Structures are given as structure tokens and as C-alpha cells.
Design a protein around this ligand. Structure first.
Ligand SMILES: [Mg+2]
Ligand SMILES: [Mg+2]
Ligand SMILES: [Mg+2]
Ligand SMILES: [Mg+2]
Lengths: 176, 176, 177, 179
């Protein structure tokens, strides 16, 4: 074939061409930054997990001048805390309609969809992904989303899937 | 046309026909909505996990007019909170004998066992499953239960097993 | 050559050992729990237990088989959970694991030949070597795994205890009573 | 073939020679002692996991006279609590650049890089690892670090990767028989 090695497997050269040119990466939270689990307690405690290797990836992308934004349907202090800690400021929570949040991001940043990527794990993510150039489903994402993606990560959501996509972009940019 | 492709594998047309008819889906909690773990704390705290992709599936079935009920042997505020959040009201906790809860559900809804499904992970679930049309064991459920089931999920309990069953019914209904 | 179980294949002589077990002794961390200690910034600590193990232990006791715990650590979380399961013979903070075993053997009048033990690390070996059914969980320490006469297929904290309950219950034709 | 069996696989005798003479083992925390996850709550609670069998290994090394040091980029009371429970004193947290902490450890203990090991899981660990003799990446560490390591653990970070390295050292010291 015509495939090129990554740190994680093989991709079409056409995908690296797309990845090279990304200036905006938008991520869902649950199932992408986390593994999709919501930890619930009898006193109404709620936890969520994030992976340490993802932080390093996001920071590397932003150091390269790539904007990062988050769009999620849930709303938590957890997400505010984590995203602020990673230095991500474009945070959209409580979104039933992810398309409108995406439009708001577009109007703020003025970045074209050909230069935008999105990492999702479920069907609610599809209306935005469909519009952009890099369409990522995490390894364990909904199989119907995985069918529609142009990159399916090797690493599971919440375990380094975000880092994998950061590494893909950096490799494409010849910075890794 | 021996089998019909789903998002997860291949099913017999007879099984999709059973799925198409389902008006009531009954689920166990631990090992089905969760991975079977109970997290216990040094001040008596308790956590349990639920998965975001399951939440989406359960809402989709309810939007389609299908009733959802829960039967669990344990009792927690966690389960009350999670089920109310999803809009599930038929919640049976602290049930050692699941058959009595099943009969109560049947009488409350006037829905026949031929239009009912049950998702279980252990032997206590079998007395209810044996009565109903769609008898699901989660992928990692007890292996004797898996042998008796007429559908074994591919996704593990607590990670989208419930969503997989939701998808099967929605596919069967031509709504996926 | 081997006999099938719900989980894989064993020697008939192992099933024959399992059939006559009257006492099953378990360590806790890495056996009932997933081997992790969840620690928080305000001194929170969590430990996990698995619902299919709970069911197995109750089924084993319903069948007339005694359950005891011997752990090197002391945990009130563990006291709470074992008491909830109906287990009464709980020995914690046990440096001399073998002395605890001796006391259990005496208190119940059950011989080592009718006893099994489920462990995950080397500190478990001094009690294990004394008993007939010597179990290491699937993801136990490899030195203990190579000494065990049954290595579970299911990982620690995820049904390994249930798997051993099932081995005994299958040997007795009592898997689903 | 020149390899020697361990409890986990095969290694070159050269690696056992290095492991035999380690006097200092430096570890990252997240992804090495833990599974790399940070549990965060709505009241700002934080949890981290540690594996029950790693303590026996760390203690066995300390009882052999081997010094243990910890260098992490994150900061938590969790890590203070866990490491103090092991009798470890050289705990460096909130380290953006791990090389400085390493130099400080060298100053304090006067142990040379040739007698030093490091267990990491990501690229930030490499500038210290590159300087020392035993260079461990955990099984599921970042693939670029795994390429650079001289030992890649079989067991995943947070599930006994630390214990595995302890066992390698004990085996090398002839304190742990492997048939
Ligand atoms: Mg999601
Ligand atoms: Mg269950
Ligand atoms: Mg243990
Ligand atoms: Mg790390």
C-alpha cells in the first residue's frame, strides 16, 4: 500500500496532509478526555478521570500555536478545574446542540473547517465532526461514529487517545 | 441472509424480530450499568460508576416509547440519583428475589413477557430472564448465565453493554 | 486428560480436591479488591469489591463451606464488607499469617486437607503451602503463580474469588442452587 | 541467544549486571506508581491509585540499602502521604524540569549515575533517564520513551511495574531465585 508509520500504527499519507494543516482541535470530554465513566456517591459526590499523558500533548499543541476548545453536554466544576489547569480557555458546557457552540468558536477564532479537527466518542459529536477536516473517533467510541471517522485512535478514550492525536499532528508537522 | 449485520456482529433475523417488539427493558444495576465494582471508603463512602454512552442509549429507547425498569439487590442513593437523572421511575432496590419485582412491573405496565427484555450479569437474574423474550447477558457476565442467554453483548458491563442492547432494539425498529 | 470448568480446563485431581473443601481462606488486597488503594488529598481511602464475588461467597456458605479472611493489613472498610457478606472469621493486621491459620483450623476443627487459600503475593505462601487448594489470582505475583495448584483465569477484584467458589460448587454439582 | 530468564521474560546479561549494582532508584509517580489517571471531584477532591504489591518491592530494595527518590511534575498531599508511609524522604513534587531535582539528589546522596536507575512513563522523564544506567519505561508508557529505554516493563504502570523493577534488582543481587 501507501501507508506511513506513526508511533501507534499505520495511516494513509492523505491523513497526515490533513493533520499537518490543523490550527484548531475541538474535543468532547466524556469518553475522550475521560473513559466515559461517571463516578457517583451516596452523598452526591461525582468524580471523573483524566490521563496525565494527555496534558503533555495538549500543551505541546498549544505551544505550536494550535487552539484547543472543548464542547460538552454535561456541566461540572470538574471540567472547569481540569481545563483551566491545562490552560484551555474555550470551554463550552451544558451543550445539547454542539453545532451552535462550534459556530461560536468559529466566529471567535475565524479558523476555517479545513483547518479544524474534532475528537469525539458518540453520535452527538457527529454533526460537528462532519463539518471539519480531521474527524477522530477514539478506539472504544461508538461503532457508528468509528465508521464515519477518518482517524480511529489506537488508544482508548481517557487513556491517552487525546495524546495520540496530538502526536499525530506534531508528527505531520515534522516536530516529532 | 442467514444473519443480519449489527454494529457489533451478526444476529439471526428471529432475534431482531424479538427486539423489534420490545416494549419494556428491565436491567440489573451492578455488573450491567456498572462493571460490578463497589468502591468503599474509610468514612463509609460508596461510589459506583455509570457510562455516558449507556445514558445516551437509555434516553433514545425512552424517546421511542419503550419503558425502562431497574431491579437490584443492593440499595443506594446513588441508584436513586442516577435513575431519576435519566428519567427512569420504575426502580426496585433491595430485592433478593427479583421475580416478585418483575411481577409488580408486569402488573404496573400491563406489558407481556413476550414484549420484555432483561439485561443481567449473574445467576440471580436468570429467574426473570427465563420468563421473557429477550434474555441478555453482558459480555463479561457469569459464564453460566452467558450460556443460557439468547443475546450476549460484545461490550463489557459498565462500558456500553446497555447501549449495545439499546442499539439492537433501535436497529430492529428501523430507527438506527 | 483435563476436565472443563466454566472458565477453562483443570486436572481431575484438582476437581477432586475442590469437591471436599470445607474451609476457604482468602487474603483481601489483590484477591477481593482490584489490588489498588485509592488515596485522596484529605486522607480519603477507597477499596473495591466485586458483586459477582459477593454472590459466590454467599453461595459457598449456603452449601455449608466455611469462609475466613487472613490479611496482613488492617482495614475497617474490609471489616464492614466481610461482616455484610456474613463472614465472621476475620483476622487482620496479621504478621504471623500461619498462627492465624492454626487458630482457624483449631476453632473449626477442619484439617488442612479440606482447606483452600486464595492469595496474590509471596506473604501468602506460608499459609498456602499448608493447604490442599492453593490458588493464585490470574494477575497475582508471578512467583506465587508458579507455586499455586490453581491459577484463576479472572483477575483479582473482578471475579477471581467467584471463580474459585464456582470450582468448588461445580465439583459438588451445586453451581446454581 | 544470550538471554537470561526473569519472572517476567528474558533480558540480556548486560542488564542484570547494571541492575545488580544499583544503589539509587528514582521514580516518576503518575503512570509509574499510579495508572496515570487523576480522579477529580466537584468539590475539588482528588484521588490517585497505588498498587498493593509495589510496597513490598520498594521496602525490599530499601532493606538492601538502596536509596529511593521520587520526582513528579504534579503536587499532592496524596504523594506525600504515600511516600512517607514507605519511609522515603527524597520527594520532589511540582517539578517542571526534573533535571534540577536529579542534580539535588546527586548532591545529597553522592551516588553516581552508573549506580542509578530511573522508572518513567513520558518524555519529561527522558532528560534524567538519559543520564543514568538503568533506564526503565513502563509497559504502557509513551511509545517514544519505550524506544529509548534499556528495560521496558511487562507489567503496566500502576499495576506492578515498580515491583517488577524491584524484582529484577533482587534477582540480580542473587536475593531472588528465578528458575
Ligand atoms: Mg462523549
Ligand atoms: Mg448484577
Ligand atoms: Mg493481597
Ligand atoms: Mg508520569
Amino acid at each position: 500500500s501507501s501507508t506511513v508509520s506513526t508511533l501507534y500504527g499505520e495511516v494513509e499519507p492523505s491523513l497526515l496532509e490533513i493533520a499537518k494543516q490543523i490550527k484548531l482541535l475541538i474535543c468532547d470530554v466524556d469518553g475522550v478526555f475521560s473513559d466515559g465513566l461517571i463516578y457517583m456517591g451516596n452523598q452526591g459526590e461525582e468524580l471523573k478521570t483524566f490521563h496525565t499523558r494527555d496534558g503533555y500533548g495538549v500543551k505541546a499543541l498549544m505551544n505550536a500555536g494550535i487552539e484547543i476548545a472543548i464542547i460538552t453536554g454535561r456541566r461540572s466544576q470538574i471540567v472547569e478545574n481540569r481545563m483551566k489547569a491545562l490552560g484551555i480557555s474555550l470551554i463550552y458546557q451544558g451543550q445539547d446542540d454542539k453545532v451552535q457552540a462550534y459556530y461560536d468558536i468559529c466566529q471567535k477564532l475565524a479558523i476555517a473547517p479545513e483547518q479544524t479537527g474534532y475528537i469525539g466518542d458518540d453520535l452527538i459529536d457527529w454533526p460537528v465532526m462532519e463539518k471539519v477536516a480531521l474527524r477522530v473517533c477514539v478506539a472504544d467510541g461508538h461503532p457508528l461514529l468509528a465508521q464515519r471517522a477518518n482517524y480511529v485512535t489506537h488508544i482508548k478514550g481517557g487513556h491517552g487517545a487525546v495524546r495520540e492525536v496530538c502526536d499525530l499532528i506534531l508528527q505531520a508537522r515534522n516536530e516529532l
